[PDB]
């Protein structure tokens, strides 16, 4: 109906729009009529309606300005109101752009615009943009001000004030905020979580007046720091539109003594008084650290001050608190119950598609070359969160300017436009970077993202139909456990040699039920034994808790099951609601070491025993890991397969690098030499050659006893 | 309001608002660098310097530059708030209406709307820096009103402000007559 | 009598509403439920000093004026100081805790001073100091010297308090320990009550409290949600329901066009909540009661167990009789005893038995796993047994169950232990049951008189005793018609009450898989006899040969060592 199709106007005028006659007929619009049109991110304008009867029905013609203003592309859609009640400007406040106006002698206005808007009549609303085509040059400028406010039509008696400073241009884009969801990807769901419980409180209030509930007000985002947590909330209260008003954690912290408690007070006033409004408080854990942490009075008036703020905001009003702190644990524990941040968000490092999208959202503007494999790049980058991409763009860009730097004279101040042109980015500058860059987002538990399914693992169907009934019936059909009011089984507990693929296991396991990974290695266990680490169990947890549904994996458990750290993972386990899907998969080499409390009923009880692969599974391991290698045509890998017999996988990945070390080695002497693209063979032979097993028999042996012992004692 | 209110005072005021007043220093004995670039001796002096006042004998330091000075203090540009206001106004009447529960001040009372201790300390920022008679005509006439009677007298005074270069962004307020109510 | 003071709007279509039948606030008593003990004694402390003084001056005494309330949090402590203050209608001057700690040094002593002063003036008043342990904490807690001088004027102005004037002071905090001991002395925060997690009956009242306003589904069944909510606290329930309305609107938004501001009328008047709704929220919600030692009810009569008819017998004789018959026991002047430590095998249900006893005396049951004793003993817990003790006293009569003694007692928390139990009333109705899988290991001290000495052996389920614990695990899953399980009772001979959990478990499991499998290929309802065969072809004892004999040589050599 009135969803204008938007098309490129052939006239240049700032205030008027073409349309065709059957949409001017539909919405009873008339020619020279002035109305109300809004495209995205909530701009309006306002444009004097103009019949054209070239247009297709259902579309309309803007010029470059008007879509520049309304943030839209040419095929995008505009709602089209009436706007009968615009009063005539009193008293227009303008300035113009500093780099248009360089260059212009005499009365900029006088030769610009009073001939412009001079019996024209053209609607002008702050903040828009209008260019003025005066003899050579082309100038725009900006609606400042307007009175009546916060547009009206600027009639002949209408008084101009051009009088003031030239604005800098660097402003609009370097300060590029009010970006919408179009900036962000790769976080669908955590960003669809925050936009259900802000918009809906926000933009239909009677929902909840209908239902007859009282919203939820806080909320509380954590995560690796560098996710784009400030960006996403930035992006969400500008789609919204509200009253948005960022509170910072250290520009609070700075203040002088009985200063910081002002400025929240004044904060949350100012938000309340202007209802709806959405206060994000960024950093919230300097404000409001761990107890145990600064135990000053002035690190304690403020906690005071910001808890007492919360509990009285609990009213009518529409306000929604949005905290941002790195790890759950940080935050004081008495701002995380009822009437305060209840609600929590877990970031999590993006997959292959979040780096891609990511990728293409910061390599929009580089000069880029044809040699661009973006999904390369994405495929190879893991554990980039966003800040480590934008980092690896800019290393990328810098290299190739050192690369081009040859053409360049730094004395001189001048560089001819010529050069500037040939800059380009290549694979080769992406690859150096990545050489160079620095991810430090693993370093910490963090929630990831896999995607490993029943093909990467050999074998195991046995295991497989366990793991499949064990955890895949819970989560898809929950209907049924509630029906027989059985309990879901927790967790299962790994166990055999090394090196037989458990971690695939739960992989697999995670991706058939669409559940995040968390990956908890021993060396992470034992830091926090020794308590130097910087995340404690419960926030791994609360995490778990969080992100669900999820699915925590504990490796080489025994070093820790040999205990302070036991007891805080059996009370979190007792803890953990049991209806909420979260699988806690431990894994360990020595069964009998662990303590047994771990293994009661209501904890990690099933034990499964993870065996060697068997032929054909060292065949399919063998097909799997040289999908992406250069192989001898003809070459069969069944013998190989067959000749390492009782080899776990991590031999046959050894045998395989070995091999693949050998072809590189004798391809890099032929070409030093100077042949040999894939692999013969006699480097397989050599390498098998070379072959060594990972597992004595006895400990093979012990094992099997383990397992014999086990089925004896359900045996009968 | 997403930004400074709008509203409309005095032209002094105004003319006031537009200047900066910092106060350049020269090379410092003390300084160790080239010509360009200073390091923390030759950078201008604010125009709320304290030292600065009491060593010129200066004892307020005129309202404007406290103005100036809590708009630095605070407000950073383009980013980090939205324009909390920095100048109000104290308010001692207790709140007839907050209601966390309680009933008006006469009949109950929470820890919200009880007025805290009140802390009297001197001022530091004077509002109008220096008076100033067009003519001394104006209060010997007056005062003469007491030597011919000799009962004391009382008298609002007329005039406008303007601009006082001797202090920082100082204001002056010159009287150009005398009025005497019935007493 | 032990109300007497509940039995019998808030001082107040158009003359209904104004008669009441954002700041909606004088909640009324109707407003609350599944604290009904609580309530009655916080009104009975508070009204009768007020409203009916003359009784105090006829009988010649001075009321009481510490109340101190402390619970879990989100149980409702304000909800009920709030009530009762508007309730009694009289001047009502309320302290925030964090509100005060946040003014400016030297301004959080005028506040209290004055607050006090016009409750005094305006008399008679109720001082409600809301989060009191932000104000005073423990002495080691805080060591700033503000923190001294609010908690030393605090003091002061408590002291000086008593006096004929009608006022009544009321504080609150989630930890009983937290508070200044010098704040727990005669004249000042005397009484002491206790605030539990609430029953199902208590959780169905708060559900239908809450669930009052919305357009709740034809088909909702609040009293299986109050049912299955075990631990749920008040504010978890309100933030269930308020999660259940948000599911609700989020599958309705499909219809709902987020561009218009407004939405069409007749979707804004379909919404309603519907039972999948709440088992949604359930499975998102997450109590954090539990997390710490509470105070819960128990309805565990003696039919959820089977068999141990003797055990049953002495346990009677030793609790229910003093209890309810406490006036014979003076008679003979024989005073009851204190404790009672069960020993056994793993999983013979000695925690049922514990749930029984506490509610045949109708007592409030405190628990203590081992891993809170472990907890406890590397210091890294909130709680402490002085508190658990504590709160038992405030909740008199009690059940405590210590259980898994052997962690500790393979010490510094067992000799704290003993110190408590030996410091507890011998007349105040405190009793103490521990378990123990290694009665040898125990530190014997606790076996002396007047401690845990009354030693009780739990032997494995008997063949009848067997066949009524499957009967009862059994009852509420779709069994097959004529299904016959005594022949799986007698082959279950030695086995543990988990390991027929564990039969009827995996029974159950092949009947989910199977009708996941039937509901694939379009079936089966109950459990053939099959699937329990299938699920007994894996399943076996947990308890060994060795295990048995060492129990039955130890029982024996105690009759032994008990008689001649
Ligand atoms: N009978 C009830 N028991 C518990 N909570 C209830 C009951 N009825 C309603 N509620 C709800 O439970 C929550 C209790 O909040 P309240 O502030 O009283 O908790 P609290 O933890 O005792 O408070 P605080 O320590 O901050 O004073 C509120 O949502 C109240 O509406
Ligand atoms: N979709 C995205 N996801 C994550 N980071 C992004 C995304 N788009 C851009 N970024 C970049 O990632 C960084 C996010 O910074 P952020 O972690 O929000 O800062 P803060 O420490 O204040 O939370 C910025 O450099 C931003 O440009
Ligand atoms: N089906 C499989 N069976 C065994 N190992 C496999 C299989 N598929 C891949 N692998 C390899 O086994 C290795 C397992 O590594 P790791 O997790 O450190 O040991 P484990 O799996 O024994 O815990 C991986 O590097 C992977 O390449
Ligand atoms: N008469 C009974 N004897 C043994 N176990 C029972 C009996 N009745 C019920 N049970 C089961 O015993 C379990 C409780 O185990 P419990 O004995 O408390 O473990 P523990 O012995 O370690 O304290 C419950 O799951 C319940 O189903
Ligand atoms: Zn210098
Ligand atoms: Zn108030």
């Known amino acids: ?716 | 309001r997403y930004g400074p209110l709008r509203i409309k005072e005095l032209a002094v005021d105004e003319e006031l608002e537009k200047e900066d007043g910092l106060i350049p220093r020269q090379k410092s004995k003390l300084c160790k660098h080239g010509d360009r670039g200073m390091c923390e001796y030759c950078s201008p002096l604010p125009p709320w310097d304290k030292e600065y006042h009491e060593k010129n004998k200066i004892k307020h330091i005129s309202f404007h530059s406290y103005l100036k000075k809590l708009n630095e203090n605070a407000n950073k540009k383009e980013n980090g708030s939205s324009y909390i206001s920095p100048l109000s106004e104290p308010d001692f009447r207790i709140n007839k209406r907050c209601h966390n529960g309680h009933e008006p001040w006469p009949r109950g009372i929470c820890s919200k709307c009880q007025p805290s201790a009140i802390t009297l300390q001197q001022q530091e920022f004077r509002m109008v820096d220096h008076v100033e008679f067009q003519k001394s005509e104006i209060i010997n006439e007056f005062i003469q009103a007491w030597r011919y009677t000799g009962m004391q007298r009382f008298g609002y005074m007329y005039g406008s402000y303007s601009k006082y270069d001797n202090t920082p962004l100082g204001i002056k307020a010159v009287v150009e007559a005398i009025y005497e109510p019935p007493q």
């Open chain 1, 1 to 716: 109906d009135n969803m204008l199709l938007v098309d490129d106007a052939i006239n240049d005028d700032n205030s008027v729009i073409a349309i065709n006659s059957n949409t001017m007929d539909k919405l009873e619009l008339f020619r020279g009529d002035t109305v109300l049109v809004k495209g995205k991110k909530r701009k309006d304008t306002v444009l004097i309606v103009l019949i054209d009867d070239e247009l297709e029905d259902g579309a309309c013609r803007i010029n470059r300005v008007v879509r520049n203003n309304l943030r839209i592309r040419l095929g995008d859609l505009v709602t089209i109101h009436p706007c009968p009640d615009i009063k005539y400007a009193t008293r227009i406040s303008v300035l113009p752009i500093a780099d248009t106006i360089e260059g212009i002698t005499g009365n900029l206005f006088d030769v610009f615009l009073k001939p412009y808007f001079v019996e024209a009549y053209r609607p002008v609303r702050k903040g828009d943009h209008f260019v003025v085509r005066g003899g050579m040059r082309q100038v725009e400028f900006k609606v400042v001000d307007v009175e009546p406010e916060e547009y009206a039509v600027v009639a002949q008696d209408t008084i101009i004030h051009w009088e003031g400073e030239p604005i800098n241009r660097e402003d609009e884009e370097n300060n590029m905020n009010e970006v919408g969801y179009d900036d962000i990807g790769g976080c669908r769901k955590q960003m669809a979580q925050i936009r259900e419980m802000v918009e809906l409180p926000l933009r239909h209030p009677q929902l909840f007046k209908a239902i007859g509930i009282k919203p939820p007000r806080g909320v509380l985002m954590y995560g690796p720091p560098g996710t784009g947590k400030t960006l996403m909330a930035r992006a969400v209260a500008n789609e919204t539109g509200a009253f948005f008003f960022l509170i910072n954690g250290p520009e609070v912290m700075s203040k002088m003594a009985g200063e910081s408690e002002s400025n929240l007070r004044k904060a949350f006033e100012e938000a309340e008084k202007n209802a709806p409004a959405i206060i994000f408080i960024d950093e919230i854990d300097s404000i409001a650290p761990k107890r145990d942490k600064t135990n000053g009075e002035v690190e304690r008036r403020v906690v005071s001050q910001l808890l007492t703020l919360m509990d009285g905001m609990k009213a009518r009003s529409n306000v929604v608190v949005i905290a941002a702190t790195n790890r759950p644990n940080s935050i004081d524990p008495a701002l995380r119950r009822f009437g305060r941040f209840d609600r929590e968000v877990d970031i999590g490092i993006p997959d292959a598609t979040g780096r891609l999208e990511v990728l293409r959202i910061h390599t929009k503007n580089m000069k880029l070359a044809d040699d661009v494999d973006l999904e390369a790049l994405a495929a190879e980058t893991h554990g980039y969160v966003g800040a480590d991409i934008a980092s690896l763009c800019s290393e990328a860009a810098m290299q190739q300017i050192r690369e081009k730097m040859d053409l360049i004279d730094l004395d001189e101040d001048e560089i001819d436009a010529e050069v500037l042109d040939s800059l380009g980015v290549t694979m080769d500058n992406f690859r150096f970077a990545l050489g160079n860059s620095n991810p430090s987002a693993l370093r910490e538990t963090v929630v990831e993202s896999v995607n490993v399914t029943w093909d990467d693992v050999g074998g195991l169907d046995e295991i497989k139909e366990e793991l499949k009934e064990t955890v895949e019936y819970p989560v898809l059909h929950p209907d049924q456990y509630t029906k027989f009011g059985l309990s879901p089984s927790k967790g299962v507990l790994f166990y055999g040699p090394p090196g037989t693929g458990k971690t695939l296991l739960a992989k697999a396991v995670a991706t058939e039920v669409s559940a995040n990974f968390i990956s908890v290695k021993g060396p992470e266990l034992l830091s926090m034994w020794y308590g130097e680490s910087e995340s404690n169990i419960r926030d791994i947890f609360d995490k778990a808790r969080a992100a669900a549904p999820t699915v925590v994996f504990l490796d080489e458990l025994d070093s820790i099951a040999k205990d302070r750290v036991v007891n805080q993972l059996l009370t979190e386990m007792d803890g953990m609601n049991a209806k909420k899907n979260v699988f806690v998969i431990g894994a360990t080499n020595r069964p009998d070491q662990i303590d047994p409390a771990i293994l009661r009923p209501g904890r990690l009880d099933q034990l499964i025993y993870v065996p060697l692969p068997d032929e054909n599974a060292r065949l399919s391991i063998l097909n799997a890991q040289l999908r992406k290698t250069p192989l001898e045509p003809g070459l069969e890998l069944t013998a190989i397969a067959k000749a390492t017999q009782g080899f776990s996988g991590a031999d046959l990945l050894y045998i395989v690098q070995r091999a693949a070390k050998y072809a590189i080695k004798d391809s890099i002497e032929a070409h030093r030499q100077h042949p040999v693209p894939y692999i013969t063979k006699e480097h397989f032979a050599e390498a098998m050659k070379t072959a060594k097993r990972s597992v004595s028999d006895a400990e093979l042996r012990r094992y099997e006893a383990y397992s014999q012992q086990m089925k004896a004692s359900r045996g009968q």
